[PDB]
PDB file of C-alpha atoms and ligand atoms in Angstrom:
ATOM      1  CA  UNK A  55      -7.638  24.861  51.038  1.00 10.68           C
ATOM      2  CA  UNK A  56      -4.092  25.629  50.302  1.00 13.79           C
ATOM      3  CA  UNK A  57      -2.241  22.863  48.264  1.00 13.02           C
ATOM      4  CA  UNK A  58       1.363  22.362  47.112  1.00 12.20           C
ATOM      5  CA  UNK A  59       1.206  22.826  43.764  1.00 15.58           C
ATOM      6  CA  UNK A  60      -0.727  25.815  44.137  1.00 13.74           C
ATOM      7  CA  UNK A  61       2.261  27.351  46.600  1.00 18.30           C
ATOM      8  CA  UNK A  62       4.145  26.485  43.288  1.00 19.03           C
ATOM      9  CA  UNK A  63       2.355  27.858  41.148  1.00 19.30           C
ATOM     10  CA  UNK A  64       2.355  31.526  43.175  1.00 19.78           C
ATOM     11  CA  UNK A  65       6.177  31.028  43.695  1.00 19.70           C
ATOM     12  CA  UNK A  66       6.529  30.424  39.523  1.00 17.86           C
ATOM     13  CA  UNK A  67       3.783  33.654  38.762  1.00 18.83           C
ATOM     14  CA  UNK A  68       6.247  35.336  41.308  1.00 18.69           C
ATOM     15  CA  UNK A  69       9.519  34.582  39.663  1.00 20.61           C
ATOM     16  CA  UNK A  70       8.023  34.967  36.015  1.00 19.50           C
ATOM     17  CA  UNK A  71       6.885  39.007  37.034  1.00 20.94           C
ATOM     18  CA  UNK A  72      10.396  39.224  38.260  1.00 22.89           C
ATOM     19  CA  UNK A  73      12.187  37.965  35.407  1.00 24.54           C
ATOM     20  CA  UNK A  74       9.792  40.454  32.559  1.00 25.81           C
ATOM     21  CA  UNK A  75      10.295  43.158  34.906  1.00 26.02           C
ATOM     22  CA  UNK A  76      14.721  42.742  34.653  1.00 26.13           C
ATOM     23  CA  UNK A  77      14.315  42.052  31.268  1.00 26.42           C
ATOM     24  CA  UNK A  78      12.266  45.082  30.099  1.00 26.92           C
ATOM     25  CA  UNK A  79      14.824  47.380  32.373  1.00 30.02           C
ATOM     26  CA  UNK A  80      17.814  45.464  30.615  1.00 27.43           C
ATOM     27  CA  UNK A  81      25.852  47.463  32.759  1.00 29.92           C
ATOM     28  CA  UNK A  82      25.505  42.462  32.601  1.00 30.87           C
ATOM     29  CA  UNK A  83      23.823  43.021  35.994  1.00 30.94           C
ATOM     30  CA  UNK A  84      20.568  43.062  34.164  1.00 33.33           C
ATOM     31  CA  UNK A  85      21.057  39.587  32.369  1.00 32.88           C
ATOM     32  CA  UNK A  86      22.173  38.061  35.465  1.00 33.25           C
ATOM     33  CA  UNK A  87      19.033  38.811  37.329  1.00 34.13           C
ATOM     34  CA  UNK A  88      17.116  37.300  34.533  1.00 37.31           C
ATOM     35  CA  UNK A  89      18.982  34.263  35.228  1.00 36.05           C
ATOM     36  CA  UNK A  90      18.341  34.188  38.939  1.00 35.03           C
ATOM     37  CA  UNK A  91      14.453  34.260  38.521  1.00 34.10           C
ATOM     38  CA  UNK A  92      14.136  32.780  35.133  1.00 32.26           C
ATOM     39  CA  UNK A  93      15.779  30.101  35.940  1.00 35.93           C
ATOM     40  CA  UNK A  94      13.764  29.935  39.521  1.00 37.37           C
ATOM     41  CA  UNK A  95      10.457  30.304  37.458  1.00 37.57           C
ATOM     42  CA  UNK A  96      11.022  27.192  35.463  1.00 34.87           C
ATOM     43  CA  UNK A  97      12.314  25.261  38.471  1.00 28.53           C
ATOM     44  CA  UNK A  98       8.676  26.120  40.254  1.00 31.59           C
ATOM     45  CA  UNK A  99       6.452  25.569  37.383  1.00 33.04           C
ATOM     46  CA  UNK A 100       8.191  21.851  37.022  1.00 27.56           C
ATOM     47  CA  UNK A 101       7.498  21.545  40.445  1.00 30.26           C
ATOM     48  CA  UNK A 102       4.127  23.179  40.514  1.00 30.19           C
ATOM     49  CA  UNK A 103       3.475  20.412  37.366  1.00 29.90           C
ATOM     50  CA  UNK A 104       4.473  17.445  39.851  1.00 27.46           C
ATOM     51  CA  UNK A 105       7.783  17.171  38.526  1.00 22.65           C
ATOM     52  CA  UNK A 106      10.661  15.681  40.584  1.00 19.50           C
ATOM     53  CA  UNK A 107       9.466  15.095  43.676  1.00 21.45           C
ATOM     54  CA  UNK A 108      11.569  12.295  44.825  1.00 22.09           C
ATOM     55  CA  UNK A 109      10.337   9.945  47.655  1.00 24.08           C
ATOM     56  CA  UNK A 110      13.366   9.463  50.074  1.00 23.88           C
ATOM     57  CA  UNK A 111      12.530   6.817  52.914  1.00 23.67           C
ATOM     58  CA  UNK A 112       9.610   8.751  54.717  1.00 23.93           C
ATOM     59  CA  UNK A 113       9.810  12.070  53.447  1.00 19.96           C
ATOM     60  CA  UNK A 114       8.670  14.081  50.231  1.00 22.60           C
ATOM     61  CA  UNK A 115      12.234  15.649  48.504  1.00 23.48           C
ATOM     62  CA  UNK A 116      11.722  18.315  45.928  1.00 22.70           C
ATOM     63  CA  UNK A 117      14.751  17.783  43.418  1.00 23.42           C
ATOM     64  CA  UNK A 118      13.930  21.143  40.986  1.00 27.57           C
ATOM     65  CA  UNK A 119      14.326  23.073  43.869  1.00 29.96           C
ATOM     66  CA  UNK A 120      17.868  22.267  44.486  1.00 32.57           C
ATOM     67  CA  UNK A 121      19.187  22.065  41.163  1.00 31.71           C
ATOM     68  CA  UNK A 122      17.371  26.047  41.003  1.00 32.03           C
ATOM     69  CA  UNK A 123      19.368  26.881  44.258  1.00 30.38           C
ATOM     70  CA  UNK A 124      22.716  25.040  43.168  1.00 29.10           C
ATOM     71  CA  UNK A 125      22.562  27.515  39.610  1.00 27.43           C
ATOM     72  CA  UNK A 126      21.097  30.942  41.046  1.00 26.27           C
ATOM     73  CA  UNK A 127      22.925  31.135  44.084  1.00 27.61           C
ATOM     74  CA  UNK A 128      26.168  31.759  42.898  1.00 29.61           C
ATOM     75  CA  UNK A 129      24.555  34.186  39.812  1.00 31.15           C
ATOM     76  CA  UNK A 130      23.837  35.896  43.169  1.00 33.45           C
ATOM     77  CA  UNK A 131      27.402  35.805  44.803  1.00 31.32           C
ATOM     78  CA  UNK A 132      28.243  36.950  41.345  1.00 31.05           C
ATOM     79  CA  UNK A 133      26.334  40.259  41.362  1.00 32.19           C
ATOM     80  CA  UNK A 134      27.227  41.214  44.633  1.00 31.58           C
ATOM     81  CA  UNK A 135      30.753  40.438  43.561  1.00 29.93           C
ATOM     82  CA  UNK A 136      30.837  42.497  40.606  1.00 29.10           C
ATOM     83  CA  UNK A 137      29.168  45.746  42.822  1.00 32.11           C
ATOM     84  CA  UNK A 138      32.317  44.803  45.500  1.00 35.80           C
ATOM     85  CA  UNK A 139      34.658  44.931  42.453  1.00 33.75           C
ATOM     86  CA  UNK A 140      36.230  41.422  43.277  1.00 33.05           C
ATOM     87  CA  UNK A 141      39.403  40.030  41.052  1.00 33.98           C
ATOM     88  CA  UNK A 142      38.525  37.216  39.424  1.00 32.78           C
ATOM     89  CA  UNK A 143      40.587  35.520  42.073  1.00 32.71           C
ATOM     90  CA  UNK A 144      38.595  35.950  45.048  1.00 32.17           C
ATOM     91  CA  UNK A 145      35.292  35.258  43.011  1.00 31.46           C
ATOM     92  CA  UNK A 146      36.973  31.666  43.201  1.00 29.57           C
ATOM     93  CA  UNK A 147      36.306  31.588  46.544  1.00 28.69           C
ATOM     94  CA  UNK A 148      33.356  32.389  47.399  1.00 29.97           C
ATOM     95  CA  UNK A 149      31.640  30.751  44.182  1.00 31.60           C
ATOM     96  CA  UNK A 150      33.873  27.726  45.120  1.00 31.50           C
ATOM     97  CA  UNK A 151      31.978  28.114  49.127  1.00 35.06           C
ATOM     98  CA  UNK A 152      28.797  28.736  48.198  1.00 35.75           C
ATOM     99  CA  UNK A 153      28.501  25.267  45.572  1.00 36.66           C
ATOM    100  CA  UNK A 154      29.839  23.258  48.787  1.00 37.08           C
ATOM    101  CA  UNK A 155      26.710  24.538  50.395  1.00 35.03           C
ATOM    102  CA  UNK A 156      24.679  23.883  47.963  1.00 35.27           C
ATOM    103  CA  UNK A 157      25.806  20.447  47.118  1.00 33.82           C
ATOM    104  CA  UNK A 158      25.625  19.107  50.989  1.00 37.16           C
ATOM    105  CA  UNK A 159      22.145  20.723  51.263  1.00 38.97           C
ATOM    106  CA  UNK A 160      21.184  18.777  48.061  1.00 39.65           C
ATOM    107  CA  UNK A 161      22.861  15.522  49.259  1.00 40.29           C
ATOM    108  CA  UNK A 162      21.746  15.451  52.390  1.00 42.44           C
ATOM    109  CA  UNK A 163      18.013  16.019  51.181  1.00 41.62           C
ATOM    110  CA  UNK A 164      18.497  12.792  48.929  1.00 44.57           C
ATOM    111  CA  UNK A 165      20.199  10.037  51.609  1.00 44.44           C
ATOM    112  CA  UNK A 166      17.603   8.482  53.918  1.00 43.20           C
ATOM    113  CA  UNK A 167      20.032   7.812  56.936  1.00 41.90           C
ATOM    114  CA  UNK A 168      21.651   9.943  59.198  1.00 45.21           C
ATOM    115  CA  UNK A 169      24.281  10.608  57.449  1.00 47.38           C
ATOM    116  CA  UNK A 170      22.206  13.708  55.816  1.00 48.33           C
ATOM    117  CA  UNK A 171      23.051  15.431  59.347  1.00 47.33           C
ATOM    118  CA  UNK A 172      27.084  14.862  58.257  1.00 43.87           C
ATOM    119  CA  UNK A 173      26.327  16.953  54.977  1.00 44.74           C
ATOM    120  CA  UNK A 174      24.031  19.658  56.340  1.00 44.72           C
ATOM    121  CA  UNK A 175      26.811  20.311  58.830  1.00 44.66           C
ATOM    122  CA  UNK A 176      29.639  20.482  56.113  1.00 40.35           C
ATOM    123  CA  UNK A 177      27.238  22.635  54.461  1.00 36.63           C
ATOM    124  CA  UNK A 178      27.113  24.754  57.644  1.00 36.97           C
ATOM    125  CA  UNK A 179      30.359  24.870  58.095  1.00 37.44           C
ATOM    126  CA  UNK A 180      30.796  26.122  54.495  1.00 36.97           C
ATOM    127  CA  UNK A 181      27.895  29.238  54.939  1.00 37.37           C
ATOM    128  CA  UNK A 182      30.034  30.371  57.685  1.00 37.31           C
ATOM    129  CA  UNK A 183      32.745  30.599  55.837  1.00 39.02           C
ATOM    130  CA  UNK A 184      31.090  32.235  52.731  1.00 39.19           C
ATOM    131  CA  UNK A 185      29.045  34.854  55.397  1.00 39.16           C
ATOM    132  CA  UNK A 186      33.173  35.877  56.579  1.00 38.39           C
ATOM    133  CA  UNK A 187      33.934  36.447  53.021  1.00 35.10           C
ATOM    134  CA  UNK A 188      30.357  38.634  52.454  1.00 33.55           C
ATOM    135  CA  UNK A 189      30.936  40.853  55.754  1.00 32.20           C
ATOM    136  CA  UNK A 190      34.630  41.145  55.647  1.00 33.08           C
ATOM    137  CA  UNK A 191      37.124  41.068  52.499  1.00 35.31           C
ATOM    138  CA  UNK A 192      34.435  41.882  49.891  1.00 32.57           C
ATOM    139  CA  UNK A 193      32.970  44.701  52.448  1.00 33.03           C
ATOM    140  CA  UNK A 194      36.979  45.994  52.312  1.00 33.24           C
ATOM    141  CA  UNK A 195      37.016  45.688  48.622  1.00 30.73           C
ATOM    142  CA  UNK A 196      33.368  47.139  48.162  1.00 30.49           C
ATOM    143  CA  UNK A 197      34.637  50.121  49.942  1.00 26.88           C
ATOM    144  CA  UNK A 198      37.417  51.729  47.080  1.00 27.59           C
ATOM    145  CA  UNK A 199      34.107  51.937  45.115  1.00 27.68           C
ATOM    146  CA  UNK A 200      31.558  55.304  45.241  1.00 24.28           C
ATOM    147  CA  UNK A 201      29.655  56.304  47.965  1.00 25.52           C
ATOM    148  CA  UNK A 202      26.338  54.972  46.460  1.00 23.72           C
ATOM    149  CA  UNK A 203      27.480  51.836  44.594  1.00 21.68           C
ATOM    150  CA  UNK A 204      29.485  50.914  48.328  1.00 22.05           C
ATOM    151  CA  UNK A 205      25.442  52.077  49.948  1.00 22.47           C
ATOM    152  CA  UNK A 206      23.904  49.499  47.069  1.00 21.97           C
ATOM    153  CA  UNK A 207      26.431  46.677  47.847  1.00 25.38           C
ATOM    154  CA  UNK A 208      25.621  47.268  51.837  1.00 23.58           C
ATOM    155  CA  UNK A 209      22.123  47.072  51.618  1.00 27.40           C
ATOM    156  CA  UNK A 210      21.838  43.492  49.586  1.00 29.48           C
ATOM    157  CA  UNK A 211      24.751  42.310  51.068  1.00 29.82           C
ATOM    158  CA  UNK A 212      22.555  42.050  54.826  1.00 30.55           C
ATOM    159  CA  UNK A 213      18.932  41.179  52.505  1.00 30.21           C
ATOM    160  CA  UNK A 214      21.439  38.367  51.906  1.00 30.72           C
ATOM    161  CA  UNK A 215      23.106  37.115  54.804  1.00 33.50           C
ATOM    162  CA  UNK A 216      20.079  37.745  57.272  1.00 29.12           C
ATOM    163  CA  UNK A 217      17.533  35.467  55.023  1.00 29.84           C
ATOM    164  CA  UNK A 218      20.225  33.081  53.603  1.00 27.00           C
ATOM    165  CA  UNK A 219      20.631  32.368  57.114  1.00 26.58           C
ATOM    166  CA  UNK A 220      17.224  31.473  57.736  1.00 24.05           C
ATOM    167  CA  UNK A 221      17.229  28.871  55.108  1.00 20.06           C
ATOM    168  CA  UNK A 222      19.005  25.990  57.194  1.00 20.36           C
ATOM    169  CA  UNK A 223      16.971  26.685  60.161  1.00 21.10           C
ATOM    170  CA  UNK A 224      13.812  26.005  57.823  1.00 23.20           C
ATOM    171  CA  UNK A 225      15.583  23.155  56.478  1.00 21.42           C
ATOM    172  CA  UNK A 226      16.579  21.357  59.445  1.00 22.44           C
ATOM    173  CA  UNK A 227      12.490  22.061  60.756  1.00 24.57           C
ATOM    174  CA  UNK A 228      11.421  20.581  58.196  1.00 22.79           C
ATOM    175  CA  UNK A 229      10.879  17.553  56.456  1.00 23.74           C
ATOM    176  CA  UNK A 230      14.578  16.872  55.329  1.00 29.42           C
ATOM    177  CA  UNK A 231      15.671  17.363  58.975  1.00 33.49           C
ATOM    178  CA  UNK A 232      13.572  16.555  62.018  1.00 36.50           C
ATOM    179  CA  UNK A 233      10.222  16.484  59.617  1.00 33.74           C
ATOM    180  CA  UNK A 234       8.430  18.875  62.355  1.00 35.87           C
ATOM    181  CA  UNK A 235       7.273  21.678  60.014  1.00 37.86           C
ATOM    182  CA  UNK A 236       4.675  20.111  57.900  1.00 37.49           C
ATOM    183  CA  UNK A 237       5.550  19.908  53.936  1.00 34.71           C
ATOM    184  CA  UNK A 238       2.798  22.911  53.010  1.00 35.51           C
ATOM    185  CA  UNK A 239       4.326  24.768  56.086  1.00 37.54           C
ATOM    186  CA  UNK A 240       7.934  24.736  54.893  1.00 39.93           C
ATOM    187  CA  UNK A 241       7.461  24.954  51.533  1.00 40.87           C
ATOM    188  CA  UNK A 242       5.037  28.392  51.976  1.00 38.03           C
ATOM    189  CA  UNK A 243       7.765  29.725  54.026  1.00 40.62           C
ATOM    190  CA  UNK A 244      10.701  28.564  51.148  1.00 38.39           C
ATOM    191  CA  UNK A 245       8.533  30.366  48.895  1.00 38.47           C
ATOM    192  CA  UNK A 246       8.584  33.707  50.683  1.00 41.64           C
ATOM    193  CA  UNK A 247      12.602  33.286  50.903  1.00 41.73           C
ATOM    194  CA  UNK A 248      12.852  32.377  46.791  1.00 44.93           C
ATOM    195  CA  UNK A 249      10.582  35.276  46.358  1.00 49.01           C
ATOM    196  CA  UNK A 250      12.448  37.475  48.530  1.00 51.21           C
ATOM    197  CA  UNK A 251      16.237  36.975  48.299  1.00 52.67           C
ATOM    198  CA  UNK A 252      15.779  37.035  44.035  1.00 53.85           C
ATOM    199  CA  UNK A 253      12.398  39.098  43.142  1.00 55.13           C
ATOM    200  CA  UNK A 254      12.928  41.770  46.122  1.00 56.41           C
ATOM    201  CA  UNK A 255      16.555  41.833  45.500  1.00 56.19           C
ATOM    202  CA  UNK A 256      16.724  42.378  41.666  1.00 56.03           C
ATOM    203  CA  UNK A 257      13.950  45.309  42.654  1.00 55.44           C
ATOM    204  CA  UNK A 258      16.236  46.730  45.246  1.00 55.96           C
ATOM    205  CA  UNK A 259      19.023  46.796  42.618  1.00 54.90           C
ATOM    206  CA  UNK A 260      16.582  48.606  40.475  1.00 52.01           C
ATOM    207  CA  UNK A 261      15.700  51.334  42.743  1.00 52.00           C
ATOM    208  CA  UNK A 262      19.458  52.081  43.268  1.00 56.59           C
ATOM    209  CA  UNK A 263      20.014  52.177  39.123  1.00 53.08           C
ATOM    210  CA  UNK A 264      16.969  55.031  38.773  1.00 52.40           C
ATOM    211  CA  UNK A 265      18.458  57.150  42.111  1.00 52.97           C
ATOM    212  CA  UNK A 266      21.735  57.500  39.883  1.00 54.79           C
TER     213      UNK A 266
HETATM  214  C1  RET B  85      17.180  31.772  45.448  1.00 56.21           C
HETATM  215  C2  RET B  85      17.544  30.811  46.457  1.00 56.21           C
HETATM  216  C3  RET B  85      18.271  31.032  47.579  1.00 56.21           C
HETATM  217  C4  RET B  85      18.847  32.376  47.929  1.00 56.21           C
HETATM  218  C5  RET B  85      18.567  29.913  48.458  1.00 56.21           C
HETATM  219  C6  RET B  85      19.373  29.925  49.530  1.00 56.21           C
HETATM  220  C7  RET B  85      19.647  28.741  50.296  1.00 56.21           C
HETATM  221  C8  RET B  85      20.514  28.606  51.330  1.00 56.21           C
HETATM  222  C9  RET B  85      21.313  29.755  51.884  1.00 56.21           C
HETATM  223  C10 RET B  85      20.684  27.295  51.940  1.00 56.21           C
HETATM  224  C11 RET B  85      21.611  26.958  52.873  1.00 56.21           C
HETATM  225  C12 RET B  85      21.850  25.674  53.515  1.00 56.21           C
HETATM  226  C13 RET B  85      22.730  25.575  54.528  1.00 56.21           C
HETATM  227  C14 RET B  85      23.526  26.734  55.062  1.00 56.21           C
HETATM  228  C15 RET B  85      23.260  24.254  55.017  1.00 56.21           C
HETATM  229  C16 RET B  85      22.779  23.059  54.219  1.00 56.21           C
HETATM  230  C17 RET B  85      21.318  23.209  53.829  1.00 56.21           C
HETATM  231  C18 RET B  85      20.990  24.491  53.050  1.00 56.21           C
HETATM  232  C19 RET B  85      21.229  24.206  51.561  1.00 56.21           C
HETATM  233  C20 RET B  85      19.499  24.788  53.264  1.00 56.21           C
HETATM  234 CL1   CL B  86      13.561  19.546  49.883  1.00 58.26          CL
END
């Protein structure tokens, strides 16, 4: 009833409402959320075509989808960096923790053997590190700011961290881990998270640039 390439296809019509929506409202905080769900839109709509998916010994790998995450998530970092009021130094670091992530997750997803548990856990080890820097230092620096641009950092900083840390559970469920959750099972819940942490963020941001 419910196919993959239609779950694409909702997760591209998603992204593309998204990405009008920042445009038309387009203060660079506007361009980057075009990039986060432009870019997302045209990863899905390859995808929802039949594009890249990449048989890897008994499993179904979806490459778009990590070449999407390895480009948006840091344009995310980025704007929560820029509301913190980071020096271009410590923007190193995080943007230098978060590609780590991203790279093991898409590495692991492509090797066949095992060793994809090696890279997920660098990966892991990685999001902790980026989740100190989110919570911690950039919370401190966030704070010399306003009352309500410190308020707009606070609020997507935890949309962040709470559903970025969902994403290796429904990795390791699914078919690049333990293959329990079905393909059409993960990928409708990966859709909700896309949807979610870059659509439902960039409207949050929104909200907060009207209650000015
Ligand atoms: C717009 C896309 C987003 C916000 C994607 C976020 C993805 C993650 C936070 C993935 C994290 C992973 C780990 C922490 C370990 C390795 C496997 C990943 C890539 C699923
Ligand atoms: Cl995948």
């Amino acid at each position: 009833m419910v196919g993959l390439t239609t779950l694409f296809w909702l997760g591209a019509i998603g992204m593309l409402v998204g990405t009008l929506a920042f445009a038309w409202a387009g203060e660079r905080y506007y361009v980057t959320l075009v990039g986060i769900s432009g870019i997302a839109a045209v990863a899905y709509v390859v995808m929802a075509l039949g594009v890249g998916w990449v048989p890897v010994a008994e499993r179904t790998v979806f490459a778009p989808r990590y070449i999407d995450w390895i480009l948006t998530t840091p344009l995310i970092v980025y704007f929560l960096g820029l509301l913190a009021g980071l020096d271009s130094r410590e923007f190193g670091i995080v943007i230098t923790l978060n590609t780590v992530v991203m790279l093991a997750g898409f590495a692991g997803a492509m090797v066949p053997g095992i060793e994809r548990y090696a890279l997920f856990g660098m990966g892991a080890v990685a999001f902790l590190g980026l989740v100190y820097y989110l919570v911690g230092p950039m919370t401190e620096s966030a704070s010399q700011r306003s009352s309500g641009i410190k308020s707009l950092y606070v609020r997507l900083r935890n949309l962040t961290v709470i559903l970025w840390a969902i994403y290796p559970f429904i990795w390791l469920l699914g078919p690049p881990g333990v293959a329990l959750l079905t393909p059409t099972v993960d990928v409708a819940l990966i859709v909700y998270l896309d949807l979610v942490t870059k659509v439902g963020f960039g409207f949050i941001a929104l909200d907060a640039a009207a209650t000015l």
